[PDB]
Amino acid sequence: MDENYFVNYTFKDRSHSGRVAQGIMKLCLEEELFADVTISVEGREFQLHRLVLSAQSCFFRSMFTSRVIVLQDVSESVFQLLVDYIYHGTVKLRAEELQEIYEVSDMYQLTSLFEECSRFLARTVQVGNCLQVMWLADRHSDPELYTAAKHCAKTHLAQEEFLHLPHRLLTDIISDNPTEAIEAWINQITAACKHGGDLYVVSIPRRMWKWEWCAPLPRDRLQHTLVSVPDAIYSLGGKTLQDTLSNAVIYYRVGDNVWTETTQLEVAVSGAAGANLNGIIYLLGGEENDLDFFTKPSRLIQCFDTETDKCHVKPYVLPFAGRMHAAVHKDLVFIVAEGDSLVCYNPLLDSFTRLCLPEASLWKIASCNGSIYVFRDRANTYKLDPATSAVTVT
Amino acid sequence: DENYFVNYTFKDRSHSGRVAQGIMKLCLEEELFADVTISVEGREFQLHRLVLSAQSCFFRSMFTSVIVLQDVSESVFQLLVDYIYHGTVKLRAEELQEIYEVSDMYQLTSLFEECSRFLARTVQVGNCLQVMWLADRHSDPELYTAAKHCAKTHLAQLQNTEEFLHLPHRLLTDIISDGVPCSQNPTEAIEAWINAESLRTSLKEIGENVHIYLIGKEHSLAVSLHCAEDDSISVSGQNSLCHQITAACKHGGDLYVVGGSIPRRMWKCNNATVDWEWCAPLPRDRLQHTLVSVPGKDAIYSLGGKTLQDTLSNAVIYYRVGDNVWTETTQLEVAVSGAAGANLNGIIYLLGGEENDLDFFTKPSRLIQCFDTETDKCHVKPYVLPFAGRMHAAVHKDLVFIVAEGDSLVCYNPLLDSFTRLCLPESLWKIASCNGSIYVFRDRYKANTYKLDPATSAVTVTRLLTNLQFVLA
Amino acid sequence: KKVCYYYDGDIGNYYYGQGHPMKPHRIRMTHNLLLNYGLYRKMEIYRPHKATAEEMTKYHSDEYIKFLRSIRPDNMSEYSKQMQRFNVGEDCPVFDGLFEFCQLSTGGSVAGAVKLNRQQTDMAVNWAGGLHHAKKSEASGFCYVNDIVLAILELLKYHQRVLYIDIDIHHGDGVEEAFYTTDRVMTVSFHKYGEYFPGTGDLRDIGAGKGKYYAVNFPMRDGIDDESYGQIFKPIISKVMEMYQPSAVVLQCGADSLSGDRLGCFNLTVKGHAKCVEVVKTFNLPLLMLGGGGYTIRNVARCWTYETAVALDCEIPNELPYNDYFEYFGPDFKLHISPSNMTNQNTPEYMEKIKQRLFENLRMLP
Ligand SMILES: Cn1nnc(-c2ccc3c(c2)[nH]c2nc(Cc4ccccc4)nc(N[C@H]4CC[C@H](N)CC4)c23)n1
Ligand SMILES: [Zn+2]
Hints:
- The complex is a heterotrimer, with 2 copies of chain A and 1 copy of chain C.
- The relative contact order of chain A is 0.05.
- Chain A is globular, with a radius of gyration of 26 Å.
- By secondary structure, chain A is of the alpha+beta class.
- Chain A is built from 10 helices and 23 strands.
- Chain C has a single domain (4-363), classed as Histone deacetylase domain (Arginase, Chain A), CATH 3.40.800.20.
- In chain C, 33% of the residues lie in helices and 9% in strands.
- Chain C has 11 helices and 8 strands.
- Chain C has an 8-stranded parallel sheet.
- In chain C, strand 1 (3-6), helix 1 and strand 2 form a beta-alpha-beta unit.
- The radius of gyration of chain C is 19 Å and the shape is globular.
- The two termini of chain C are 32 Å apart.
- At the B-C interface, strand 16 of B face loops of C.
- Strand 5 of chain A pairs antiparallel with strand 1 of chain B, so a sheet runs across the interface.
- Bound molecules: the ligand Cn1nnc(-c2ccc3c(c2)[nH]c2nc(Cc4ccccc4)nc(N[C@H]4CC[C@H](N)CC4)c23)n1 and zinc ion.
- Zinc ion binds at residues 168-170, 254, 256, 293 of chain C.
- Chain B: InterPro entries: BACK, BTB-kelch_protein, BTB/POZ_dom, KBTBD4, KBTBD4_BACK, KBTBD4_BTB_POZ, Kelch-typ_b-propeller, Kelch_2.
């Protein structure tokens, strides 16, 4: 550069963003000052602030720049929590006032909340309300929610809202007993993985069968993970033939039966659980190195970026260490192990959620299109609804 | 957040940035919602009560209780407000005194501490008394000590500063409280200070000690230097260990060398005698391990280094000076060898070396990893150095000077995570910091030593071992 | 029982070069301490015969031995391409009369092993041998000839299965390499591991092939004290000899393990170190105590007299006799040393995990 620290340099305060954020938090809601505006919703009056409202929302900037002002279609509760979000930044989302918050936060320019409610409305879509959600995602500019509504409309198309559905939506619904429904119209082994209906399985740790034959692994490993990224099957971690923990990662392109080598994990783990989340690979705990000569149950989270080919440890630790098995339901991973203590991990947010399990053996959690299926190692097929936390025997 | 499918709290980690970047884009780019007008020297500025109150605790006390101030100047106010709104300001040496006083008066601590550190880093004997008095008035501990220390080191020259004569007794006593080596002759100036009991009852003479040790000529000789007079260096020791030194560290006024056949032993020269002592041998078979001396722990650290099997070692072992024992500590994040090592007020920095390449090789390294002595934990800096390889780092004041292969010389500051390129006159060089200056030594001479100051980036030539394998600060 | 002592008088005159750690003078120190200590009379003292090169080459390659026979300080400029492939020259320096010392060291070790070989005695204290690092093809460590291998090889002629316990800080890689494959020799070393000189001993490494489950190595960390060492040593050897039942033990007492060593990171007391000898003595088998690695010559002497006293089952006092080397020892002038305090990174769970793992490494032993 051209800045002598002994003569002239510029100082960048990395704590400025937090300082102003908390200054707003403390000096706006806890004690009301410098309000300079008043907004009335359904009778209730909110003593807001012009600057904050027009700072992270361009509806209140384009609508303020160009005394008491009354809104048109928002509830007094929903708008109040919106105010909290625009002021605190941490709001409490609830499934009852979800359909409304989606629209009000969309017609306001609050993008982060718009995506948040989009994810909420996409992970709680039900076949009964699927078509209504599809119409909701049609009126508003939401492609991701539109596809999520399309899936539940397609994978359950066999079973009012569909009777009067316009042909425009029906074309997209049918693009991806179909004819009967459309008649009405608008009138041993070490590792393994499932790649779109191909139950690939790993004599010696080199054989692969699909039975059939495939290219052999470029490394002999045990207790190595295996994922099904849709565009190759990845192998990470493991224990070497010399009883030492592995640290290498290799692809497997389905088209060309070659295993390419790539970046190494920052922490060599074994027996970890693997979960692919929309192109990012999550390794779940495992048997980490201990005392430089043995292993220990571990609670560590490994985020490996497939597109960019990088690896990283998040500081957060799993609630229960040791061997674990995980599955991807929707937008998040459900993690279980022996102990009947199911946990839910949502990678986008920084938080877990614990849930009780029947006492009933190491559990084996799955993730079907319909719902979750937690198996027992000894205890029959189960199906639990995460919304109610209630499990029903098959 | 009981149930993600029913009800949970939603937290935006990007909200603070959404607001901070929604404030610059409005309150400055397109002035709106300006409730309050504040004028400095007849220069009105349209300002918001909310932002200034949310950052300053002094303006808030005025808003709650067209304001016009008196002490502050217009130019310093412009960038002060551009700091409140932006957070980034361009500090300049000429006007920093005013920034110090104004920012302290406005309780803006961040831009008060960073100029309480700018002042503490550019303090010289010309203005040492003035800054020390100012720090006393503004009740600044770190700058007060960093100004009294400079005054106490150069007390001999300050005897005719005309401010030493016009000083309150408390300040003179605090100056003569510690340090003040006999080379400066404290009694001579103290006698003229009256022109009188506390001054003479407590004046501890530290005594000048050798502060620079060169190792070289390969019967390898270790010569000692002590910068004296003005901008001049001298010689006060020609000790020869008659062994093969492979590593060294300077702790206090002592030179802890390591080496000999099977270089695992230790020695120590007090520089007061040619009688070497014997210390606990290094408990590891490692070479190219950096030696860092931490005076605030009375310890010497050995970090990194190659093993006898040509595999890099990420092991750190310290050595207590009093107990005379080597003890293990937390390992480094990545293994290095030959990395320059510098300790900055308790934090040990490992700069570069030869990181292990993927294909069983030792690539030249550019990482900066720091291991905190107090927390005893090590972590890697996200950014990297511009040059990689062998280099000789020397802490100067609060920042690190790094001369690698070539002639480029960066000035890494850890707090700001920023560098500053400086061009040396036109060979792998070496540097150190005697007194309050930087000395740069040529690896092989057959001019040898250049003394430079970062201010004005000037390199003055100042003026016998053929080889210079090790130079210690 | 009867005790045999082997020491040639002119074994402390083999200067290793200036500044080298290993000084064979320590061998004289012990033998000078024994006379003034009132122990020489009680023990049968012999004189070691220079082992012939043809006898020395029973394990080492013939070219290596001839190279040793010819290398001299003067006739060395021509001998320049041989030092760079035999590891001689820098770490294992050449010195005046190198091969003569190489024969004196192997002499008493093989004569002793002959004496227990003939079922004539019980203990053979050769404080001059114990060089456990010289590899078959070339030198290593500070050694040149691995006298231990010749001693074991002599025992193997008559004894069926033989033990070798090593308590030197280093791994003694030479002996292990010499008997990795074979099942007739059970080597158990208590070394220090992790960025140390040998670098070969690891819990995962055992004798390959026919030597499966034999070469029991115990890695350790720095600063292990006497109580931990006692607690670990006994319940392993008492199980090894309980599933191996060796006919004879070859036990090596390296003096690196003591505290205050030049090249050792351990923390030990002479009682703690010379308790391995009172442990093995209670098994009542032919026992061959060798010398070995020791670099604190003052502590090496203090250590090596004490196991000599233990072998005789004699009791000896702390006050040192006024010998020739009396001025060398500490101002207290006592025999027993106190351990300067240093942290023991051998945590109880760590040692217990290794002890258990070793226990199944011997329960699988046939
Ligand atoms: C039973 N026993 N007692 N003491 C030893 C012993 C024996 C040897 C060494 C040693 C201890 N410590 C040492 N440290 C170093 C410094 C170093 C460390 C890491 C990487 C490079 C150098 N180099 C050593 N030797 C080299 C081997 C290659 C040869 N070309 C020159 C000499 C040795 N064994
Ligand atoms: Zn040894």
